mmCIF file of all heavy atoms in Angstrom:
data_model
loop_
_atom_site.group_PDB
_atom_site.id
_atom_site.type_symbol
_atom_site.label_atom_id
_atom_site.label_comp_id
_atom_site.label_asym_id
_atom_site.label_seq_id
_atom_site.Cartn_x
_atom_site.Cartn_y
_atom_site.Cartn_z
ATOM 1 N N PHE A 122 -58.815 186.776 240.362
ATOM 2 C CA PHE A 122 -59.618 187.620 239.545
ATOM 3 C C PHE A 122 -60.906 187.982 240.219
ATOM 4 O O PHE A 122 -61.686 187.028 240.585
ATOM 5 C CB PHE A 122 -59.913 187.048 238.194
ATOM 6 C CG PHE A 122 -58.637 187.137 237.257
ATOM 7 C CD1 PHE A 122 -57.805 186.116 237.104
ATOM 8 C CD2 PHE A 122 -58.479 188.303 236.503
ATOM 9 C CE1 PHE A 122 -56.712 186.183 236.206
ATOM 10 C CE2 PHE A 122 -57.435 188.409 235.599
ATOM 11 C CZ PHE A 122 -56.575 187.346 235.491
ATOM 12 N N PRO A 123 -61.308 189.253 240.540
ATOM 13 C CA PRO A 123 -62.433 189.597 241.255
ATOM 14 C C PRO A 123 -63.810 189.231 240.545
ATOM 15 O O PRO A 123 -63.834 189.175 239.285
ATOM 16 C CB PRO A 123 -62.392 191.104 241.320
ATOM 17 C CG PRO A 123 -61.045 191.584 241.032
ATOM 18 C CD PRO A 123 -60.495 190.415 240.156
ATOM 19 N N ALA A 124 -64.733 188.891 241.398
ATOM 20 C CA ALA A 124 -65.982 188.212 241.046
ATOM 21 C C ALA A 124 -66.712 189.026 239.880
ATOM 22 O O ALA A 124 -67.219 188.379 239.005
ATOM 23 C CB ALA A 124 -66.868 188.070 242.225
ATOM 24 N N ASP A 125 -66.760 190.385 240.081
ATOM 25 C CA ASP A 125 -67.492 191.178 239.010
ATOM 26 C C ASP A 125 -66.453 192.155 238.435
ATOM 27 O O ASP A 125 -66.818 193.208 237.970
ATOM 28 C CB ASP A 125 -68.785 191.778 239.416
ATOM 29 C CG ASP A 125 -68.620 192.766 240.519
ATOM 30 O OD1 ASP A 125 -67.778 192.515 241.347
ATOM 31 O OD2 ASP A 125 -69.313 193.834 240.453
ATOM 32 N N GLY A 126 -65.197 191.685 238.237
ATOM 33 C CA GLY A 126 -64.212 192.287 237.328
ATOM 34 C C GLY A 126 -64.623 192.090 235.931
ATOM 35 O O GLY A 126 -65.421 191.286 235.512
ATOM 36 N N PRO A 127 -63.826 192.866 235.056
ATOM 37 C CA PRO A 127 -64.142 192.662 233.576
ATOM 38 C C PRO A 127 -63.677 191.280 233.051
ATOM 39 O O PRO A 127 -64.123 190.892 232.000
ATOM 40 C CB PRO A 127 -63.223 193.761 232.985
ATOM 41 C CG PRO A 127 -62.087 193.973 234.026
ATOM 42 C CD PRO A 127 -62.727 193.692 235.360
ATOM 43 N N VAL A 128 -62.833 190.631 233.807
ATOM 44 C CA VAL A 128 -62.417 189.264 233.352
ATOM 45 C C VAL A 128 -63.492 188.252 233.646
ATOM 46 O O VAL A 128 -63.904 187.456 232.818
ATOM 47 C CB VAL A 128 -61.040 188.912 233.953
ATOM 48 C CG1 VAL A 128 -60.771 187.395 233.792
ATOM 49 C CG2 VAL A 128 -59.911 189.692 233.273
ATOM 50 N N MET A 129 -63.911 188.134 234.896
ATOM 51 C CA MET A 129 -64.905 187.145 235.268
ATOM 52 C C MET A 129 -66.304 187.525 234.677
ATOM 53 O O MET A 129 -67.103 186.574 234.523
ATOM 54 C CB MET A 129 -64.967 187.045 236.824
ATOM 55 C CG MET A 129 -63.686 186.521 237.427
ATOM 56 S SD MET A 129 -62.960 185.194 236.530
ATOM 57 C CE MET A 129 -64.095 183.832 237.017
ATOM 58 N N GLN A 130 -66.550 188.764 234.418
ATOM 59 C CA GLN A 130 -67.895 189.139 233.813
ATOM 60 C C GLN A 130 -67.775 189.267 232.293
ATOM 61 O O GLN A 130 -68.752 189.623 231.621
ATOM 62 C CB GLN A 130 -68.486 190.437 234.375
ATOM 63 C CG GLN A 130 -68.671 190.374 235.878
ATOM 64 C CD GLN A 130 -69.707 189.334 236.182
ATOM 65 O OE1 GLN A 130 -70.829 189.492 235.788
ATOM 66 N NE2 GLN A 130 -69.270 188.247 236.829
ATOM 67 N N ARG A 131 -66.587 188.974 231.754
ATOM 68 C CA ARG A 131 -66.384 188.925 230.296
ATOM 69 C C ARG A 131 -66.730 190.237 229.546
ATOM 70 O O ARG A 131 -67.465 190.208 228.605
ATOM 71 C CB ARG A 131 -67.279 187.840 229.567
ATOM 72 C CG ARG A 131 -67.291 186.419 230.080
ATOM 73 C CD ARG A 131 -67.730 185.403 229.041
ATOM 74 N NE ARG A 131 -66.582 184.859 228.357
ATOM 75 C CZ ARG A 131 -66.292 184.815 227.036
ATOM 76 N NH1 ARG A 131 -67.329 184.761 226.239
ATOM 77 N NH2 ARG A 131 -65.094 184.593 226.573
ATOM 78 N N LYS A 132 -66.316 191.396 230.125
ATOM 79 C CA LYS A 132 -66.728 192.676 229.597
ATOM 80 C C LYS A 132 -65.446 193.312 228.910
ATOM 81 O O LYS A 132 -65.484 194.547 228.678
ATOM 82 C CB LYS A 132 -67.423 193.511 230.659
ATOM 83 C CG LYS A 132 -68.680 192.876 231.219
ATOM 84 C CD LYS A 132 -69.915 193.697 231.370
ATOM 85 C CE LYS A 132 -71.077 193.049 232.134
ATOM 86 N NZ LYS A 132 -71.688 191.900 231.426
ATOM 87 N N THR A 133 -64.597 192.512 228.414
ATOM 88 C CA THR A 133 -63.427 193.059 227.618
ATOM 89 C C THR A 133 -63.836 192.975 226.135
ATOM 90 O O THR A 133 -64.628 192.174 225.756
ATOM 91 C CB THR A 133 -62.113 192.219 227.813
ATOM 92 O OG1 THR A 133 -62.273 190.930 227.198
ATOM 93 C CG2 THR A 133 -61.890 192.091 229.321
ATOM 94 N N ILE A 134 -63.329 193.952 225.334
ATOM 95 C CA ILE A 134 -63.685 194.156 223.941
ATOM 96 C C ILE A 134 -62.420 193.697 223.204
ATOM 97 O O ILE A 134 -62.569 192.812 222.375
ATOM 98 C CB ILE A 134 -64.098 195.540 223.620
ATOM 99 C CG1 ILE A 134 -65.612 195.779 223.976
ATOM 100 C CG2 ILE A 134 -63.849 195.925 222.173
ATOM 101 C CD1 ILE A 134 -66.114 197.192 223.881
ATOM 102 N N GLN A 135 -61.285 194.171 223.547
ATOM 103 C CA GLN A 135 -60.012 193.802 222.786
ATOM 104 C C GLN A 135 -58.818 194.279 223.548
ATOM 105 O O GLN A 135 -58.880 195.125 224.354
ATOM 106 C CB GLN A 135 -59.749 194.651 221.534
ATOM 107 C CG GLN A 135 -60.818 194.701 220.482
ATOM 108 C CD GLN A 135 -60.912 193.399 219.848
ATOM 109 O OE1 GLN A 135 -59.960 192.593 219.619
ATOM 110 N NE2 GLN A 135 -62.165 192.992 219.579
ATOM 111 N N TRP A 136 -57.634 193.739 223.201
ATOM 112 C CA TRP A 136 -56.383 194.284 223.632
ATOM 113 C C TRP A 136 -56.069 195.490 222.722
ATOM 114 O O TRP A 136 -56.379 195.514 221.557
ATOM 115 C CB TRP A 136 -55.229 193.306 223.470
ATOM 116 C CG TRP A 136 -55.204 192.176 224.504
ATOM 117 C CD1 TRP A 136 -55.597 190.920 224.312
ATOM 118 C CD2 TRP A 136 -54.772 192.269 225.872
ATOM 119 N NE1 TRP A 136 -55.420 190.187 225.379
ATOM 120 C CE2 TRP A 136 -54.971 190.942 226.430
ATOM 121 C CE3 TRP A 136 -54.230 193.311 226.676
ATOM 122 C CZ2 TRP A 136 -54.639 190.705 227.732
ATOM 123 C CZ3 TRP A 136 -53.953 192.989 227.995
ATOM 124 C CH2 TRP A 136 -54.081 191.739 228.516
ATOM 125 N N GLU A 137 -55.506 196.601 223.307
ATOM 126 C CA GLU A 137 -54.960 197.661 222.530
ATOM 127 C C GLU A 137 -53.773 197.213 221.794
ATOM 128 O O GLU A 137 -53.006 196.366 222.264
ATOM 129 C CB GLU A 137 -54.677 198.894 223.371
ATOM 130 C CG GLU A 137 -55.300 200.154 223.010
ATOM 131 C CD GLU A 137 -55.080 201.449 223.787
ATOM 132 O OE1 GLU A 137 -53.945 201.505 224.391
ATOM 133 O OE2 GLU A 137 -55.908 202.398 223.865
#
Side-chain angles (χ1 to χ4, degrees):
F122 284 96
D125 69 320
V128 164
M129 297 317 283
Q130 305 292 294
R131 310 203 93 230
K132 300 224 191 295
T133 74
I134 281 172
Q135 302 293 321
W136 288 103
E137 236 182 28

